[PDB]
A = this chain, B = another copy of it.
Amino acid sequence: GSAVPFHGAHQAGIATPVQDRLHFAAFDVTTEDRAAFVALLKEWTAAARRLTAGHAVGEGAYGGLPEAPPDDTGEALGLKPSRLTLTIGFGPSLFTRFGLADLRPEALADLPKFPGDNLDRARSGGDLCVQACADDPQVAVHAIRNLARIGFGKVVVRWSQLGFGKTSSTTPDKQTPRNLLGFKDGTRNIAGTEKDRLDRFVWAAEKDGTPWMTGGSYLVARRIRMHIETWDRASLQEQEDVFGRDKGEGAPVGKAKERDEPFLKAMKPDAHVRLAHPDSNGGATLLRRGYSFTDGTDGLGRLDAGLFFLAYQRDIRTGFVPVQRNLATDALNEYIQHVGSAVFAVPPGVRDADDWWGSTLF
């Protein structure tokens, strides 16, 4: 229930321990006034300082002038901060505005097309994003709702996604959660404590070529539908061969414990862990921070389940791209389909009560 500090060299919500619920929104900008947009970034930062501390935005949710709408919509009243983090990111399409083209980072690479892609252009892309994570979904919704409200006229919501439960871990000392295919997910991820691994694989550095990004990261979001009907009729052995780990313990094939190191040659050549593993990808390493979703039925008598996949990396070209290319022959492909996609530059942290989101860019 405690708060997660908002200030830092880095934005919270990345190396932070992974909170139970997610509300992810992508925004398009509807003002051509750079001054208006900068004032928005400052106002949103002020709201976030309140929101992540458990306080109502502006002058509160009630007790103001009767004839004016309340500053805060009020549904988080009486709730604790619940580890709320707010993480902001800039889409490639934002740099065509306010004269930012010269500032687009080289590591904000558009993704190539991948075999199997069935991307819905409505649930893809976006000028900027806010990732709201909390252990209470009312807290996460309230923050997105109130950010959008404050941005009325300057931004609209392009698309959003709710994650009802995490499928990722930055704390290997705690239990690994399972995804909706029933497998532990997050065993071999980067930990929030591994400060040297985060420096090499996650945080952008001055020398990488884009000084305003020093301290930030790069985010890939993929909405991935799961063919649970097809999966749920596969034998237990078939499911375990697809991944290279047993279902119960989550141990690499042949071994006894979830955290024993995989021996890649014992796995099938198209096994998911074998293909995604850094050793198979020239050392490429990712920080996975995704969440499960279900969005009703598919209209055909079945539940609609999937995974909202989020990966943070130091450079999209040396993180997500090579690992995803190596998955062209993944046995998991038979059961999944990518149906939404977006990349964002996540700027450095808000340094103190005078700093603001995107201040190094603007």
Report A's interface with B, CB cutoff 8 A: 1, 23, 25, 28, 61-70, 73-80, 82, 122, 135-138, 141, 144-145, 148-149, 156-162, 164-167, 169-171, 175, 178-183, 228-229, 232-237, 239, 246-248, 292, 294-297, 299, 301-303, 305
Contact = CB atoms under 8 A, between A and B. Distances in A.
A157 B234 contact: no
Contact of A122 (B137, B295, B299): B299
Contacts of A305: 141, 145
Kindly list the 6 A-B residue pairs having the minimum CB-CB distance in the complex, ordered from nearest.
A74-B182, A156-B301, A66-B237, A62-B248, A136-B167, A1-B170
19 contacts: A1-B170, A61-B247, A62-B236, A66-B235, A69-B233, A70-B239, A73-B180, A73-B232, A76-B178, A77-B248, A78-B175, A136-B167, A138-B164, A138-B180, A138-B292, A156-B301, A160-B296, A162-B164, A162-B295
Nearest to A182: B74
A48 B114 CA distance: 42
A57 to B, nearest CB: 12
A117 B237 CA distance: 50
A295 B296 contact: yes
Contacts of A171: 78-80
A164 B295 CA distance: 11
A296 B159 contact: yes
A161 to B, nearest CB: 7
Contacts of A144: 303
Given A1-B169, A246-B62, A160 B294 contact: yes
Given A228-B145, A235-B69, A294-B160, A77 B178 contact: yes
A273 to B, nearest CB: 17
A234 B136 contact: no
Contacts of A303: 141, 144-145, 148, 157, 160
A55 to B, nearest CB: 14
A178 B75 contact: yes
A229 B144 CA distance: 12
Contacts of A149: 229, 232
A257 B74 CA distance: 18
Given A233-B69, A236-B66, A303-B145, A74 B247 contact: yes
A74 B249 CA distance: 12
Contacts of A166: 138
Contacts of A235: 66-69
Contacts of A62: 236, 246-248
